[PDB]
Amino acid sequence: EDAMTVLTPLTEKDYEGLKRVLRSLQAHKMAWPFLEPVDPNDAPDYYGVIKEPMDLATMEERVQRRYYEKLTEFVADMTKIFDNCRYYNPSDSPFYQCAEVLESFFVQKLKGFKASRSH
C-alpha cells in the first residue's frame, strides 16, 4: 500500500466512494455467506477458533458511523472477512470458493476507488 492509502485521512467524498464499494459486494451473487455475522447454531465452535470475526453488516454499521479514519483500516476489516473464512473452512468447501471470488472482485473495485480519489 502506497503513500496515500496509509496516510491520507478519509474525506466526505472518499466516504461516498466507500459506500458504493460496500454496496457492490453486498449485491454480488457470491456474497451470501458474508452478509451477516456467522450464526453459531450453524457452526457451534466457530467463535472459539476465530478470534476477530467480521462480516459486511458490521462493516456497513462502521461506514455509517464514520469509524474508519484511513483507507488501510477499511481494507483491513474487509481482508479479515476473507482470511477468517479460508482459515476456518477447508480448501474444497463452497465457503472457501466464495472467499476466492469475492476477494478478487473487491480488489477490482478497490483499484477503481484509489484511481478516483485525486482527480
Ligand X SMILES: CCNC(=O)N1CCN(C(C)=O)CC1
Question: What's the farthest any 2 CA atoms get from each other in the chain?
Answer: 48
For residues 21-40, which are near ligand X according to CB under 6 A?
33, 38
Compute how many residues bind ligand X; rule: CB under 6 A: 9
Cβ-closest residue to ligand X? 42
Q: In whole angstroms, what separates CA 67 from the centre of its chain? A: 14
- Which of 62, 80 has the CB closer to ligand X? 80
46 binds ligand X (CB under 6 A): yes
Block residue for cell numbers 466464495: 98
- Which of 58, 89 has the CB closer to ligand X? 89
Nearest to 53 by CA among 33, 27, 24, 28: 33
Span interacting with ligand X, options 2-10, 19-27, 84-92, 101-109, rule CB under 6 A: 84-92
- Which of 95, 105 has the CB closer to ligand X? 95
Nearest to 47 by CA among 100, 93, 84: 84
Nearest to 26 by CA among 53, 49, 60, 50: 60
Cell of 9: 485521512
Among 10, 21, 31, 95, binds ligand X (CB under 6 A): 95
Q: Which residues bind ligand X (CB under 6 A)?
A: 33, 38, 42-43, 46, 85, 88-89, 95
